Design a protein around this ligand. Structure first.
Ligand code: CLM
Ligand code: CLM
Length: 160
């Protein structure tokens, strides 16, 4: 069914990926420093600052995007910017990309651990990470775009 492949993100993918977040909450979950409306320029700025920007493809469509927020050779990487096409939610795209990013963290960065953090309102992300073997380690206070306090739940998982 949902055959998925991956490759590094390319300039040609920017518009498509920038179309993924459907509301301010979704943008905040994936890219908390971004400002709504999202734009190719904001996506390109993240890609420049980060590593490992990767897309997931199915039936000739880019359906997902992720990168590393943090990377420390021999130590850990932290997942960032997970976005999924609105017509492909709940089909395994985020799960698939997390596995790809785990492999890349192991292979390229010799990471022993992957970190995933999710904002408290992002139930789906918390639950998916839990399904994939991530455990919560800490909770940090953050603020949303309206200045309201939110909880960032910081999870991790050993790699192999
Ligand atoms: O789909 C969600 N969260 C997933 C969990 O894997 C992920 O955090 C995500 C965030 C933003 C997004 N987007 O804006 O396209 C897509 C997936 C919630 Cl918005 Cl319901
Ligand atoms: O700054 C630029 N490129 C960098 C890489 O050198 C990166 O691609 C980027 C693009 C857009 C951007 N932005 O508009 O915020 C920031 C960085 C060009 Cl606009 Cl000159």
């Amino acid at each position: 069914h949902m055959q998925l492949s991956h490759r590094p993100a390319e300039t040609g993918d920017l518009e498509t990926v920038a179309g993924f977040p459907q509301d301010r909450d979704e943008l905040f979950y994936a890219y908390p420093k971004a400002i709504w409306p999202f734009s190719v320029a904001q996506l390109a700025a993240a890609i420049a600052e980060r590593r490992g920007s990767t897309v997931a493809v199915h039936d000739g469509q880019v359906l997902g995007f992720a990168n590393f927020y943090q990377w420390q050779h021999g130590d850990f990487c932290a997942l960032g910017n997970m976005m999924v096409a609105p017509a492909a939610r709940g089909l395994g795209v985020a799960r698939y990309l997390i596995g790809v990013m785990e492999n890349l963290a192991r292979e390229q960065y010799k990471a022993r651990l992957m970190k995933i953090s999710a904002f408290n309102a992002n139930a789906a992300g918390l639950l998916l990470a839990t399904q994939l073997g991530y455990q919560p380690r800490a909770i940090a206070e953050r603020h949303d775009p309206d200045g309201r306090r939110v909880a960032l739940i910081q999870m991790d998982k050993p790699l192999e």
